[PDB]
Amino acid sequence: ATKAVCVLKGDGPVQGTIHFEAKGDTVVVTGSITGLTEGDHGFHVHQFGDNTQGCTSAGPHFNPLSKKHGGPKDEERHVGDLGNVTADKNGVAIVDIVDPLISLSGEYSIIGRTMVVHEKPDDLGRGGNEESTKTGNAGSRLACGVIGIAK
Amino acid sequence: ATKAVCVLKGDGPVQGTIHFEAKGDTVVVTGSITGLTEGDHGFHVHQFGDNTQGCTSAGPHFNPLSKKHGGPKDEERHVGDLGNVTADKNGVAIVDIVDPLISLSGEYSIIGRTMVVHEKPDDLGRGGNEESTKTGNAGSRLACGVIGIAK
Ligand SMILES: [Cu+2]
Ligand SMILES: [Cu+2]
Ligand SMILES: [Zn+2]
Ligand SMILES: [Zn+2]
């Protein structure tokens, strides 16, 4: 199972297509998100691929190792913690990420789970309040999609 | 996972929430679909969880064992062949299928793949032609969604 895709949709204008590819021992994340406000936006893999109640039903960040929230370069982070994507003034964010914790098969597989792009910047677990340790104070979910197997 | 869920969405009025629960070597499929025309509608699991082009990008019916299209009860069927769901006059179809072929884990898990509800009834590979043993002449794809892991 080597390629996956995720189409992000929400109640507003934010949309995007994210691609995942197993390369070597890692996973390459690419694609783009449009309709975003300029600046940073939290970008995470949530535990469930449940869109029955919008992006809400996706639950907390994918966290099989029971850790606290952090940035993608931290030792202490959720498997789903891919940090921030950055939208330019035109509202476009180009995604290009390589991540050591997610996978497309087995225990760390994100197939069947939800990709979410947030309203605000992820403070990488350094905000100082309890919320930072769970979600990075990234706020509401602007758009999401279930990660599916791609050809 | 022992539980999965799928939210069907299309370009028209059809929409639904489908539930999947593993039970023994079976998967119990339940839920409902609304906005359908009265009568039967093909209900299949397509290969890819790719929604980059509505339900078209989902690809063919999930068929890992390379067999011809049939109905759920047939030995010669595609794994994704779940048959027909029936809409009443109000166009609501209550889904209730117990299938021994689809699985929520292993080599031919349907998690990360696409659930598709069709325009026409599925003839179950008994329509008399060639389109009958590939799609069962179910027609266009009205609504679809990627099957995600549920809580
Ligand atoms: Cu998040
Ligand atoms: Cu079909
Ligand atoms: Zn997190
Ligand atoms: Zn089929």
Side-chain angles (χ1 to χ4, degrees):
Chain A
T2 73
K3 301 218 275 179
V5 60
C6 182
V7 179
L8 306 175
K9 278 163 206 300
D11 289 343
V14 179
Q15 52 196 164
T17 294
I18 310 302
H19 298 88
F20 307 82
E21 181 173 351
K23 279 168 73 171
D25 296 315
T26 199
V27 171
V28 178
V29 190
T30 52
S32 69
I33 303 160
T34 59
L36 291 172
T37 53
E38 180 182 4
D40 287 3
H41 289 87
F43 188 54
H44 314 122
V45 182
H46 285 240
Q47 193 189 355
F48 307 112
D50 191 329
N51 187 70
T52 62
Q53 294 179 358
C55 297
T56 300
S57 32
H61 297 166
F62 182 37
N63 185 26
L65 287 159
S66 316
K67 297 200 180 171
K68 284 177 181 175
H69 180 82
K73 309 303 284 223
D74 303 319
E75 169 60 62
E76 183 77 10
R77 55 165 275 194
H78 295 145
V79 167
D81 291 349
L82 302 187
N84 291 293
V85 289
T86 303
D88 59 22
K89 161 71 128 276
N90 287 328
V92 180
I94 305 298
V95 183
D96 153 345
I97 287 169
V98 160
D99 191 76
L101 297 183
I102 61 175
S103 78
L104 294 191
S105 176
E107 162 85 17
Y108 298 100
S109 182
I110 57 175
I111 300 295
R113 303 188 190 277
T114 303
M115 225 25 245
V116 169
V117 60
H118 289 274
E119 181 182 30
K120 300 171 181 300
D122 177 342
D123 65 23
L124 314 183
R126 295 163 165 76
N129 56 6
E130 185 181 21
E131 191 63 42
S132 182
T133 76
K134 302 196 171 193
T135 70
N137 291 108
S140 73
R141 312 163 184 197
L142 295 187
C144 58
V146 176
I147 299 166
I149 296 169
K151 182 177 172 58
Chain B
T2 57
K3 278 184 177 178
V5 67
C6 187
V7 174
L8 308 178
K9 187 87 211 300
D11 286 308
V14 185
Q15 63 194 156
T17 299
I18 309 300
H19 292 100
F20 302 84
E21 190 179 346
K23 195 159 141 79
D25 75 332
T26 78
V27 170
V28 183
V29 190
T30 60
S32 76
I33 305 168
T34 63
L36 294 168
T37 59
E38 175 168 7
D40 282 16
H41 294 76
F43 190 57
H44 321 131
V45 177
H46 286 216
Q47 206 178 343
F48 307 114
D50 188 336
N51 186 59
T52 53
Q53 324 236 59
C55 313
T56 303
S57 32
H61 287 178
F62 187 42
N63 185 29
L65 303 171
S66 324
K67 294 182 173 185
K68 306 177 302 277
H69 164 92
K73 307 175 167 290
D74 296 335
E75 170 164 12
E76 180 75 17
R77 55 167 273 193
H78 295 145
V79 169
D81 288 338
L82 299 180
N84 287 291
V85 293
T86 294
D88 56 16
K89 315 213 90 178
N90 304 11
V92 182
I94 310 290
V95 187
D96 198 278
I97 300 171
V98 175
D99 200 81
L101 216 47
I102 51 166
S103 185
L104 296 183
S105 66
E107 274 183 316
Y108 293 124
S109 171
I110 61 165
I111 290 187
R113 304 193 186 279
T114 296
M115 250 338 276
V116 154
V117 68
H118 290 279
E119 160 208 56
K120 295 171 197 168
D122 177 1
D123 82 54
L124 318 176
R126 299 170 160 80
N129 54 119
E130 297 66 59
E131 195 52 6
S132 166
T133 46
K134 239 166 299 118
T135 66
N137 295 115
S140 80
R141 307 168 180 196
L142 300 174
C144 59
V146 182
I147 299 168
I149 297 178
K151 184 175 182 55

